[PDB]
Design a protein around this ligand. Structure first.
Ligand SMILES: Nc1ncnc2c1ncn2[C@@H]1O[C@H](COP(=O)(O)OP(=O)(O)OP(=O)(O)O)[C@@H](O)[C@H]1O
Ligand SMILES: [Mg+2]
Length: 364
């Protein structure tokens, strides 16, 4: 694979970063990151050569990206931004991300841990490499929590102190906006994203990001309830799955004004249906809940929930009194079908009579 060419080219290549951590944690990963002492670009192009695949070079970044099957390989030259592996490693964020495993033939299968990344790994501890790490790259403030959210890891004393410092220093607000938005977009893709929100509330990061944002108990409660509803729905219908991460985000921004909220969602590069759910949540949701509680017949609820998005209904299952109604619509009302002969007798305006018969049968 690599070590052959690394030996033939006299270079030294290493599997580096999150991939190594995932391997140690027994995680399946098809995305592989390499750091090389040598010329990594030529090594990558020669790998792509021998394998006969296509290689995208990046002279500016001094890196190369090549894909074999659905497996993606990124090769990078060791750099301090020559530079030894250690110097390339210490510039990264955390200890568990700071390790490497050699693919070179002599040392193959050797985990190289300078900073005790394995020590901090087994202790479930997120730890920065250097004391200025948060000031250096503010994104890490969020990142740590995310990892701490994902793996259920605790922040070390030093790390927590530095993090709280950098947060109180407000460096988060003066951080590059794009990278922050990216980190947030990556955070919501987590299944542990709710716990990440717990850490967010704990260290108050969102208050330093979004305009006029604060925390109250009702939002948190509706977030737990949201987790319940999401778990139940994901349990019942496996083919109806959507992205639930945005729903929590819509819960958080619920109390905020429409203008800045819309601007924020457009700033997040959010999907259509999400922002549509937001606009529908602001204005039309109140009268929706009103007329929903005012519905005597099941068919009326069917008519009301028919044009609605599924996410809107899932969001509507948060109400206790509306639970059985939503569950009824999902598991019964919308599954109703008809025979042939009846349609033929109706044909001797069509959809009207169809909805009429729907009204007839769905009330049983
Ligand atoms: N903001 C950052 N500061 C320093 N190093 C970083 C930063 N972001 C990523 N890295 C380094 O890049 C490597 C992989 O990048 P990435 O941000 O995808 O993290 P990851 O471990 O791959 O997370 P995931 O497995 O969830 O994708 C990490 O091991 C880390 O050392
Ligand atoms: Mg990765």
């Amino acid at each position: 694979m690599v070590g052959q060419i690394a030996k033939e080219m006299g270079l030294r290549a290493y599997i580096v970063g999150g991939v190594v951590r995932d391997i140690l944690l027994g995680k399946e990963v098809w995305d592989v990151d390499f750091v090389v002492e040598g010329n990594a670009i030529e090594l990558a192009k020669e790998l792509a050569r021998r394998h006969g695949v296509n290689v995208h070079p990046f002279p500016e970044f001094g890196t190369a990206h090549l894909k074999i099957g659905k497996l993606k390989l990124e090769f990078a030259t060791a750099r301090r931004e020559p530079a030894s592996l250690k110097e390339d490693l210490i510039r990264r964020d955390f200890t568990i991300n700071a390790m490497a495993i050699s693919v070179n033939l002599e040392d193959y299968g050797t985990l190289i841990d300078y900073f005790g990344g394995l020590r901090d790994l087994k202790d479930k501890v997120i730890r920065v490499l250097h004391p200025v790490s948060f000031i250096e790259d503010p994104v890490r403030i969020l990142r740590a929590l995310r990892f701490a959210g994902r793996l259920n890891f605790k922040l070390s004393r030093s790390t927590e102190k530095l993090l709280k410092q950098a947060v109180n220093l407000g460096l988060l607000k003066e951080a590059p906006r794009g990278r922050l938005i990216n980190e947030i977009k990556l955070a919501l893709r987590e299944d542990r994203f709710l716990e990440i929100l717990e850490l967010y509330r704990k260290y108050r990061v969102l208050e330093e990001i979004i305009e006029g944002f604060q925390w109250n108990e009702k939002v948190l409660q509706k977030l737990y309830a949201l987790r319940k509803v999401v778990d139940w729905h994901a349990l019942e219908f496996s083919e109806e799955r959507i992205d639930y991460g945005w729903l929590y985000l819509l819960i958080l921004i619920s109390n905020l004004d429409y203008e800045r909220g819309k601007h924020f969602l457009e700033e997040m590069s959010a999907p259509s249906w999400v922002r549509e759910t937001y606009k529908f949540m602001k204005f039309k949701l109140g009268s929706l809940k009103e007329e929903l509680k005012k519905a005597k017949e099941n068919y009326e609820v069917y008519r009301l929930l028919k044009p609605l998005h599924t996410s809107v209904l899932l969001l509507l299952m948060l109400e206790e009194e509306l639970k059985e109604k939503i569950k009824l619509y999902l598991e019964k009302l919308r599954k109703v079908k008809l025979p042939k002969e009846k349609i033929e007798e109706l044909k001797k305006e069509l959809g009207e009579r169809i909805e009429e018969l729907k009204r007839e049968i769905m009330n049983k």
